[PDB]
Ligand binder design. Structure first.
Ligand code: SF4
Length: 543
């Protein structure tokens, strides 16, 4: 008997499932608490959906509980059992109160009705409500594909909410879709439909977050980002939340403490508002998975605004600070998941007692090619395609990870002919954004649109090109998709692209373990999804 079962990320054991301990470090009781939390969140979703159908209000506090719950269970987000158990209690309390408001309680699921306050009872329940609770391979596969897409959607929705933007249709959809994943009456056809609908609301969530980010901090613009370091004490901010950065920059003004970004905070440099803080230094290091080395050499405190946090080495654990829904037992936490004032005074004081960062590399990288910036360059991009200067774009967006096989993405990028342009977003970029790939007529051969959510900009750009060229099908553009995935945000990006009609996506370095043979067949037959082989073979075959 397995102590746990989790298969939601690319690194799952054997591309089958983590059954003893997660490759990410997630322990079985942590995994169990997350399974219980997801179950009661789906129950809450049913109750909220039923209230809306009865014409009754559902407060936005409930929406926030749902998004925080989903995000807390995303890969590398929260390993803190005390926090996870308390989210289970809060969810049980909330859904019991909401159910009291229903006129008709008929048909409420066990997830809607079940509750526990004792951790032991949560762990026992978890054992019978995990992935394996669904017997049927295709229904199971689609339920979990949808659930994972919803987690990614919720993450993006939550960042938009932190910045003051929320849409009732989006929160209502997430809650309804969660509930549908426990409805045994839905057919495989119903669940394939729901998968595509999930992709559509993925686009909606990304659009909302794009509007929130750009509306608050300006549209990204071309930017040179220093990757070397200064000589002052610093704080390294990681994850994705731009509001946390704004507060940190404001509070470090005049202190003598510099602020550096890491992994998915790199794109903050591209926003005009952040360029007005003189102590906002560069981007330090590479993608999340190198952090045991890079957080050590940074020397100063590190703030995780979201995933990915890897279980920290004892050498720097005392200077790791979590915030939002991030957690790790024994790491200091700065409270807040709604963009409210956060007091960074302790992290600033801590930074002053640490050495300045140890430099890993020097120079700069260029980015800021999000939708406004690229549409401003559209005529020139179009002219370069028409003249043959740009023969192909390769979308290499997505999420990086530890696997040795990901050398493929570096080698593929290096081996591309010099008449191609790489479009990127998300930490997948680190496999090739430190190479020297040049330019085509002044256009850099790597165009970084931003965070994984800024894959939205890549879709907007592709749709603009489709319009200008007068094409009937987006797939007739000279674009190859060679996307790397790791966790559930990458999953929603993939579903979003499928909902937009993008075919021929090459996904890697492996295909998700949660795709059953029949579900994978639908994706191949209707969307021509494929995987990777060697970089040299694919450099021939993909073109
Ligand atoms: S999040 Fe990934 S590595 Fe961690 S337990 Fe789940 S499948 Fe395994």
């Amino acid at each position: 008997s397995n102590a746990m079962f989790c298969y939601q990320c690319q690194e799952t054991v054997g591309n089958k499932g983590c059954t003893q301990v997660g490759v990410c470090g997630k322990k079985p009781e942590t995994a169990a608490l997350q399974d219980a939390l997801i179950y009661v969140t789906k129950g809450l979703g049913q109750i909220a959906t039923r209230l809306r159908a009865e014409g009754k209000a559902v407060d936005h506090r409930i929406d926030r509980l749902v998004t925080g719950n989903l995000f807390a269970t995303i890969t590398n987000a929260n390993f803190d059992d005390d926090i996870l158990a308390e989210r289970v209690r809060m969810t049980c309390a909330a859904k019991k109160e909401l159910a009291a408001s229903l006129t008709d309680k008929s048909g409420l699921s066990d997830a809607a009705l079940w509750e526990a306050s004792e951790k032991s009872a949560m762990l026992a329940k978890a054992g019978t409500v995990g992935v394996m609770a669904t017997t049927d391979d295709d229904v199971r596969s689609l339920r979990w594909l949808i659930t994972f897409g919803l987690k990614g959607m919720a993450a993006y929705a939550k960042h938009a909410d932190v910045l003051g933007k929320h849409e009732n249709s989006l929160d209502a959809f997430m809650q309804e879709a969660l509930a549908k994943t426990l409805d045994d009456s839905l057919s495989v056809a119903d669940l394939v439909a729901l998968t595509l609908e999930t992709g559509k609301f993925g686009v909606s969530a990304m659009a909302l977050l794009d509007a929130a980010n750009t509306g608050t901090y300006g549209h990204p613009e071309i930017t040179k980002v220093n990757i070397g370091v200064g000589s002052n004490p610093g704080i390294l901010i990681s994850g994705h939340d731009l509001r946390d950065l704004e507060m940190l920059l404001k509070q470090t003004e005049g202190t003598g403490v510099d602020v550096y970004t890491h992994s998915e905070m790199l794109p903050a440099h591209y926003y005009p508002a952040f360029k007005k803080y003189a102590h906002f230094k560069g981007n330090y290091g590479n993608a999340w998975w190198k952090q045991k080395e890079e957080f050590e050499s940074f020397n100063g405190p590190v703030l995780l605004t979201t995933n990915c946090l890897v279980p920290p080495k004892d050498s720097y654990k005392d200077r790791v600070y979590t915030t939002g829904i991030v957690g790790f037992t024994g790491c200091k936490h700065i409270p807040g998941e709604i963009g409210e004032h956060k007091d960074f005074s302790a992290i600033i004081a801590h930074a002053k007692t640490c050495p300045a960062p140890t430099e890993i590399e020097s120079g700069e990288i260029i980015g800021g090619f999000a939708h406004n910036q690229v549409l401003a360059l559209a005529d020139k991009v179009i002219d370069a395609v028409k003249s043959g200067a740009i023969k192909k774009f390769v979308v290499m967006a997505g999420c990086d990870g530890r696997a040795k096989s990901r050398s493929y993405y570096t080698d593929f990028a290096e081996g591309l002919p010099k008449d191609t342009v790489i479009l990127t977003a998300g930490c997948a970029k680190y496999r090739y954004n430190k190479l020297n790939l040049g330019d085509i007529g002044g256009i850099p051969r790597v165009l970084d649109a931003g965070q994984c959510n800024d894959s939205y900009s890549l879709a907007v750009i592709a749709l603009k090109l489709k319009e200008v060229f007068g094409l009937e099908d987006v797939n007739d553009l000279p674009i190859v998709y060679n996307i790397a995935w790791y966790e559930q945000k990458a999953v929603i990006v993939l579903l979003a692209l499928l909902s937009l009609g993008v075919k021929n996506i090459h996904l890697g370095p492996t295909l998700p373990a949660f795709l059953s043979p029949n579900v994978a067949k639908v994706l191949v037959e209707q969307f021509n999804i494929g995987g990777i082989t060697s970089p040299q073979d694919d450099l021939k075959a993909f073109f």
